[PDB]
Design a protein around this ligand. Structure first.
Ligand code: HEM
Length: 422
């Protein structure tokens, strides 16, 4: 993948290198001090040039000026300030019911197939789960993709994704159809929501709540669709990929798995539901998930606009330049991580110095992932429940490896046979 080329040029040509990404030129910056400087300061903002191909796609607007697309600091801080509320400790804690429900449903579906012969795309399974969690926790809707439902909606997302890929690398407008379908799904849910809140009905505190709250005084509900499609995608795709990677990797780490089983047996035993309080105790699982994001971050990095020509690690960089930051790249440099290709959870063990600006799967600073804790909670619940109940062996001819689509994800879907643990 392209990221591997950047890795090689970073190792070979130093901490500051000019490259072509998405057919614009920019400078990839791979020193931790530069990461700190540019990401930990409100002075530096996203580069609208890089994000415009995501703002709109093949004529149909997609993410618009959503919470991710929006580059202007002030328009952004307005949205963020209110959407933050849907992510407070109390909000997250009230999500445990949704996470538990969906994870249990997944484990049940999978146990039904666990004869050691039926192959299963863990990639697909993990995606339906992530989408079901997101759809309910964010918008209060049941999609039931784990149970065969909303197949069209599933296809839209699928194509809408391939679309974005092409939209920004191409050296079949089902895509435009899809982008529209998605936006209409949004219109419908936003609607079902208003229609219930004008039956004066008691609806609890969602992400959806806050996005509407932030689109007040808006002549159109077009920015409200922006945010809808934004969370709808941001909120399931990278989590599903993160899951898929972790499972791909674990299938060839029997020792790691043993220690994880051991751990989950103690912390949760055989209870069906994890309590919010249990998550904190899943120390070692948490290390595994970190080491997974280091080698396989679904979101490889971010861009910032350098406006004043500045000096960067002894290199004059011209003003108006897109700076590229890559956690994928840094994760794989022997300069920052000893023996980088080796998957080792102890890197994050208690007592190890935390990586210092060389690891940022959720990015850093004011534009960091608003959903970080949400995703870390969700991901522990699903992994815990898998570890508690199943064993996964990978089917022959499945490659370990990676592809650079809209985000990084496993090269092959992750085909496995399953046995009940025992
Ligand atoms: C393991 C999963 C996830 C990873 C690795 C991840 C990663 C990050 C990263 C690297 C960005 C991009 C920063 C940039 O483009 O400069 C991002 C932004 C963001 N993420 Fe996630 N994310 C994950 C899950 C979530 C979830 C579950 C949600 C939604 C509930 C979400 C919502 C967003 C949003 C809205 C932003 C933009 C925030 C802002 O600029 O204010 N993410 N995240």
């Amino acid at each position: 993948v392209l990221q591997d080329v950047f890795l090689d040029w970073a190792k070979k040509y130093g901490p500051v290198v000019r490259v072509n990404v998405f057919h614009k030129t920019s400078v990839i910056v791979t020193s931790p001090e530069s990461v700190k400087k540019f990401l930990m300061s409100t002075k530096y903002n996203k580069d609208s040039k890089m994000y415009r191909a995501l703002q709109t796609v093949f004529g149909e607007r997609l993410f618009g000026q959503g919470l991710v697309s929006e580059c202007n600091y002030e328009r952004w801080h307005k949205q963020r300030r209110v959407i933050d509320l849907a992510f407070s400790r109390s909000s997250l804690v009230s999500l445990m019911e949704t996470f538990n429900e969906k994870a249990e449903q997944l484990v049940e579906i999978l146990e039904a197939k666990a004869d050691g012969q039926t192959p299963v795309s863990m990639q697909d399974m993990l995606t339906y789960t992530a989408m079901d969690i997101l759809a309910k926790a964010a918008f209060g809707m049941e999609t039931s993709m784990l149970l065969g439902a909303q197949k069209p909606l599933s296809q839209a997302v699928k194509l809408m994704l391939e679309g974005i890929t092409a939209s920004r690398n191409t050296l079949l407008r089902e895509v435009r159809e899809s982008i529209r379908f998605l936006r209409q799904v949004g219109r419908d849910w936003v609607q079902r929501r208003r229609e219930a809140l004008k039956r004066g009905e008691e609806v609890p505190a969602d992400i959806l709540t806050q996005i509407l709250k932030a689109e007040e005084g808006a002549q159109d509900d077009e920015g409200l669709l922006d945010n809808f499609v934004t969370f709808f995608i941001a909120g399931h795709e990278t989590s599903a990929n993160h899951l898929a990677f972790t499972v791909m990797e674990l299938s060839r780490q029997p020792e790691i798995v043993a220690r994880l089983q051991a751990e989950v047996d103690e912390v949760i035993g055989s209870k069906r539901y994890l309590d919010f309080e249990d998550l904190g105790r899943l120390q070692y699982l948490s290390q595994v998930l970190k080491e997974s994001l280091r080698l396989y971050p679904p979101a490889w990095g971010t861009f910032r606009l350098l406006e004043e020509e500045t000096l960067i690690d002894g290199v004059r960089v011209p003003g108006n330049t897109p700076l590229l930051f890559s956690t994928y790249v840094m994760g794989r440099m022997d300069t920052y991580f000893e023996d980088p290709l080796t998957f080792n959870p102890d890197r994050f063990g208690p007592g190890a110095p935390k990586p210092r600006f060389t690891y940022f799967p959720f990015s850093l600073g004011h534009r960091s992932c608003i959903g970080q804790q949400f995703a870390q909670m969700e991901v522990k619940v699903v992994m815990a429940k898998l570890l508690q109940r199943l064993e996964f062996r990978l089917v022959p001819g499945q490659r370990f490896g990676l592809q650079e689509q809209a985000t990084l994800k496993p090269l092959d879907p992750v085909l496995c046979t399953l046995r009940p643990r025992g």
